[PDB]
Design a protein around this ligand. Structure first.
Ligand SMILES: *[C@@H]1O[C@H](CO)[C@@H](O[C@@H]2O[C@H](CO)[C@@H](O[C@@H]3O[C@H](CO[C@H]4O[C@H](CO)[C@@H](O)[C@H](O)[C@@H]4O[C@@H]4O[C@H](CO)[C@@H](O)[C@H](O)[C@H]4NC(C)=O)[C@@H](O)[C@H](O)[C@@H]3O)[C@H](O)[C@H]2NC(C)=O)[C@H](O)[C@H]1NC(C)=O
Ligand SMILES: *[C@@H]1O[C@H](CO)[C@@H](O[C@@H]2O[C@H](CO)[C@@H](O[C@@H]3O[C@H](CO)[C@@H](O)[C@H](O)[C@@H]3O[C@@H]3OC[C@@H](O)[C@H](O)[C@H]3O)[C@H](O)[C@H]2NC(C)=O)[C@H](O[C@H]2O[C@@H](C)[C@@H](O)[C@@H](O)[C@@H]2O)[C@H]1NC(C)=O
Ligand SMILES: *[C@@H]1O[C@H](CO)[C@@H](O[C@@H]2O[C@H](CO)[C@@H](O[C@@H]3O[C@H](CO)[C@@H](O)[C@H](O)[C@@H]3O)[C@H](O)[C@H]2NC(C)=O)[C@H](O)[C@H]1NC(C)=O
Ligand SMILES: OC[C@H]1O[C@@H](O)[C@H](O)[C@@H](O)[C@@H]1O
Length: 602
C-alpha cells in the first residue's frame, strides 16, 4: 500500500510518525548511533541500521583528496544506508568550524576569536553561507558549528573557538546559524530545527553548556558557578540559537558544579528540551558518554544508561558501535530505558532528516564540487581576516610618525619571523589535521606571499626567518614586517598556564626592531604575554588565527583599508590576574575589551 513517510509532499511531523511506527528496536537504536568513517563499511552500515557517520579531525579519504573523492566516499556510505529495509538515509557530520577545514583546498576563514573582533554579525552570516557551500561541495550535510562557548579564561585550549568573553558578542555571532542552514520562515517557532534544502547544512550549537567557564580554563573540566551566572553568561546564546532554528545541539565534556553535562537530565531534558522547547536532536561529543566515569570508559553500561536517560538523542560513539548498540539494546530489553525515550530520540533525529530534505536528496551534487575553495569565498575570508585585525600600537611615542599604513613603494623591505611564511601556523588548529600543522598544508597565501603580491614592482622584498641584529642593521631596509606567535593546537593540547609565545619569537622581534622600524604581526588564538613584544615594536597587530587568506593582513598593513577590529577579549597584564573579564571588580587590563587603534585607508 501507500507509504506516507516516502511521500515528499507530506508534512514533516506526519512523515516522522509514519516512519517511527514501522521501525524495529534495532532500526531505532541504529538511528541513534553515529560512527567514524574509519570503522564504517557497507555491511556495518546496513546490518546495524546506522543513522549517522562523521569525520573526526583529520579523518579524510586520502591526503589531498578532491571534492569529488569526498562526494564518492559519502555516497558509497549513503548507498549502503539506502539499501536497508526502510532506506533511511544517513547524515554525515564534520567539524567545519572555520570553513570546510579538514579538506584540502577548502577556504580557511579566521577562527572565531578573530570573527568576534570584527563585531560584524552579517560578515559571519556570509561566512556561514560560504561554509555551507564548501561543505556541500564534499557531499557532507552537517557541520559541528557554531561553538557558542563564552571563554572566561584564555588559558583554555579552545579560547580561539569562542567569539568573545562577552556573551552579548557571542549572541550576535549566532548569525552563523542561518548562514549555514538558511533563514527561517516568518512563521517560525523558536526551538524547531530548520535547514533550507540541499545547498545548506544542518548546524550544531556547541558545547552545551558552560564549556567556556571551566576552572583555570582546564579543558573538559568543572564549571563552578551558581544557576544565575550559568544563565547570565553561558546560556543566553543557546536561546538565540533556538530562535534561529539550529538543527542540533552538542553536549559538553565539561561538568557544572561537579555534574557531568553528558549525565545532566535537569539541563538537557528539563532546560534545553522542556524549557527552551528544542525540537532538533541532541548529540554527544566524541566518547562524551565514556568520559562520564573516571577512568573514562570504565563502566560503559552506566555511560549508556546515564546519557540516554539524561536525554541525549544521538551518540558519537564513534568507534565501538557494537558495544554501544549491544548495551543500549540490553537496557531497553530489560526495561531500564523506556521505549518512550528511544522513540523521542528517534523522532528528533528523523525530524531533522526530513526537515532538511535528506530523504529527497540523500546523495551528493557533483555540480557543487567547484564551490570548494571558490575565489569569491576566499575574497570573503580575506575581508574577514582584515576586519579581525586589532591594532594595539602604532608608534612608540605620542610624537612619532605612525608606522602604519606602510608605503607599497620602498627600495628594500624585510619580512621576518617564524609566522611570516607558514600557512599552517596562520591557520592554527582544526586545519587539515585535528591539531593543525606546520607549513604549506593547503591552498592559501602566507604573509610573505601577500607582501610580495602587494608591493610596488620596484620594491625588493627580503625574507629571513630569524635574522640576527647585524643582518638587519646592514640590510638597507626601509622597514620590516615581523610575524611571530603560537603554534597550532586544539582542545587539551592548547591548555596553557603561562601564555608565553614560543621562541624564537620575541628574540626575532627584538633583533629586527632594534635595526629598523618594524610592524609586528602577532598570530595567536588568544591574548598572550605581550609587554616585551610591545616594548620592542613600532607597531603591533593582533592578527589572531586569520586562515588561508594572508592578503587580509597586508590589506590593512599597506593601507588599502583602515584598521577597525576591536578586542573581543580582555588583554591581561599577567596570567596571575586570571580569570579577569570585563565587568569584574578590580578589572586591571593591559588593554580593555573593545580596545583597538584605527587607521584610514591609502
Ligand atoms: C607554557 O606552557 C605551554 C603549554 O603547556 C608549553 O608549550 C608546550 O611545551 C611542551 C614541552 O614542554 C610541548 O610538548 C612537547 O612537544 C614536542 C614537539 O613540540 C613541537 O611540535 C608541536 C606540534 O607537534 C608544537 O605544538 C610545539 O610547539 C613544538 O613545535 C616546535 O617548536 C619549536 C620551538 O618554537 C620550533 O622551532 C619548531 O619549528 C616547532 N615545530 C612544529 C612542528 O611546529 C614533543 O616532541 C614532546 O614529546 C612534547 O610532547 C608542547 O607541544 C607545547 N605546546 C604547544 C601548543 O606549543 C610551553 O613550553 C610553556 N612555556 C613556558 C614559558 O614555560
Ligand atoms: C578613518 O577611520 C575612522 C575610524 O575607523 C572612521 O570613523 C569610523 O567610521 C565608522 C563607519 O565607517 C563608524 O562605525 C559606525 O559606528 C556606528 C555607531 O557609532 C554604527 O551605527 C555603524 O554601524 C558603524 O559601526 C561599525 O559597524 C561595522 C562593525 O564591524 C564595526 O565594528 C562598527 O564600528 C565609526 O564609529 C567611526 N569611528 C569614529 C569614532 O569616528 C572614518 O570614517 C568615517 O568617519 C565617521 C566619523 C563617519 O562620519 C563615517 O561617515 C566616515 O566614513 C575614517 N575616515 C575616512 C575619511 O574614511
Ligand atoms: C579537572 O582536572 C583535574 C586535573 O587534571 C582532575 O583531577 C585529576 O583527576 C585524575 C583522574 O581523572 C587524577 O589522576 C589519577 O590520580 C590517581 C591518584 O594518584 C591515580 O591513582 C590514577 O591513576 C590517576 O592518574 C589526578 O590525580 C587529578 N589531579 C588533581 C590535581 O586533582 C579533575 O578530575 C578534573 N575534574 C573534572 C570535573 O573533570
Ligand atoms: O570531532 C567531533 C567533536 O569532537 C570533540 O572532541 C570536540 O570537542 C567537538 O568540538 C567536535 O565537534
Amino acid at each position: 500500500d501507500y507509504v506516507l513517510y516516502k511521500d515528499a509532499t507530506k508534512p514533516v511531523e506526519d512523515r516522522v510518525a509514519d516512519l517511527l511506527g514501522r521501525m524495529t528496536l534495532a532500526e531505532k537504536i541504529g538511528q541513534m548511533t553515529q560512527i567514524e568513517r574509519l570503522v564504517a563499511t557497507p555491511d556495518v552500515l546496513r546490518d546495524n541500521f546506522i543513522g549517522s557517520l562523521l569525520s573526526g579531525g583529520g579523518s579524510v579519504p586520502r591526503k589531498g583528496a578532491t571534492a569529488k573523492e569526498w562526494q564518492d566516499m559519502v555516497d558509497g556510505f549513503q548507498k549502503a544506508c539506502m539499501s536497508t529495509r526502510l532506506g533511511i538515509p544517513m547524515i554525515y557530520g564534520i567539524d567545519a568550524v572555520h570553513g570546510q577545514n579538514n579538506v584540502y583546498g577548502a577556504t580557511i576563514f579566521p577562527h572565531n576569536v578573530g570573527l568576534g573582533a570584527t563585531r560584524d554579525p552579517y560578515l559571519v552570516k556570509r561566512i556561514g553561507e560560504a561554509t555551507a557551500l564548501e561543505v556541500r561541495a564534499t557531499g557532507i550535510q552537517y557541520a559541528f558549528a557554531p561553538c557558542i562557548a563564552v571563554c572566561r579564561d584564555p588559558r583554555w585550549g579552545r579560547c580561539y573557538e569562542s567569539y568573545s568573553e562577552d556573551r552579548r558578542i557571542v549572541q550576535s555571532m549566532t548569525e552563523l546559524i542561518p548562514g549555514l542552514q538558511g533563514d527561517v520562515p516568518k512563521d517560525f517557532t523558536s526551538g524547531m530545527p530548520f535547514v533550507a534544502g540541499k545547498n545548506k547544512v544542518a548546524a550544531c550549537a556547541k558545547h552545551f553548556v558552560g564549556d567556556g567557564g571551566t576552572v583555570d580554563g582546564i579543558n573538559e573540566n568543572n564549571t563552578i558557578i551558581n544557576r544565575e551566572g550559568l544563565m547570565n553568561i553561558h546560556m543566553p546564546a543557546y536561546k538565540n540559537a533556538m530562535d534561529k532554528g539550529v538543527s542540533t545541539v552538542m553536549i559538553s565534556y565539561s561538568s557544572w558544579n561537579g555534574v557531568k553535562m553528558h549525565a545532566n537530565q535537569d539541563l538537557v531534558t528539563g532546560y534545553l528540551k522542556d524549557t527552551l522547547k528544542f525540537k532538533g536532536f541532541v548529540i554527544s561529543d566524541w566518547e562524551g558518554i565514556d568520559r562520564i566515569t573516571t577512568p573514562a570508559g570504565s563502566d560503559y553500561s552506566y555511560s549508556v544508561k546515564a546519557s540516554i536517560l539524561a536525554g541525549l538523542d544521538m551518540i558519537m560513539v564513534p568507534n565501538k558501535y557494537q558495544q554501544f548498540i549491544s548495551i543500549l539494546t540490553g537496557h531497553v530489553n530489560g526495561g531500564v530505558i523506556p521505549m518512550s525515550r528511544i522513540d523521542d530520540a528517534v523522532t528528533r533525529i528523523l525530524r531533522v532528516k526530513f526537515t532538511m530534505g535528506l530523504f529527497e536528496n540523500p546523495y551528493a551534487d557533483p555540480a557543487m564540487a567547484e564551490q570548494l575553495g571558490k575565489q569569491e569565498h576566499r575574497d570573503l575570508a580575506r575581508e574577514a581576516a582584515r576586519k579581525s585585525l586589532v591594532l594595539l600600537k602604532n608608534g612608540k611615542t605620542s610624537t612619532d610618525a605612525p608606522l602604519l599604513p606602510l608605503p607599497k613603494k620602498a627600495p628594500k623591505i624585510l619580512v621576518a619571523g617564524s609566522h611570516a611564511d607558514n600557512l599552517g601556523y596562520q591557520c592554527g588548529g582544526w586545519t587539515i589535521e585535528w591539531q593543525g600543522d606546520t607549513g604549506r598544508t593547503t591552498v592559501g597565501t602566507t604573509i610573505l606571499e601577500a607582501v610580495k603580491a602587494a608591493v610596488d614592482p620596484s620594491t625588493v622584498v627580503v625574507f629571513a626567518e630569524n635574522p640576527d641584529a647585524e643582518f638587519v642593521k646592514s640590510g638597507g631596509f626601509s622597514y620590516a614586517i615581523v610575524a611571530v606567535g603560537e603554534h597550532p593546537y586544539t582542545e587539551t593540547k592548547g591548555d596553557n598556564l603561562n601564555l608565553t609565545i614560543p621562541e624564537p619569537g620575541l628574540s626575532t622581534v627584538q633583533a629586527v626592531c632594534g635595526g629598523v622600524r618594524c610592524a609586528t604581526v602577532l598570530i595567536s588564538g588568544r591574548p598572550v604575554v605581550v609587554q616585551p613584544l610591545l616594548a620592542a615594536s613600532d607597531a603591533l597587530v593582533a592578527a589572531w588565527l586569520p586562515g588561508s587568506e594572508g592578503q587580509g593582513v597586508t590589506d590593512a598593513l599597506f593601507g588599502d583599508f583602515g584598521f577597525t577590529g576591536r578586542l573581543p577579549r580582555t588583554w591581561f597584564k599577567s596570567v596571575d590576574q586570571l580569570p579577569m573579564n570585563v565587568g569584574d571588580a578590580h578589572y586591571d587590563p593591559l588593554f580593555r575589551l573593545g580596545y583597538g587603534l584605527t587607521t584610514n585607508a591609502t
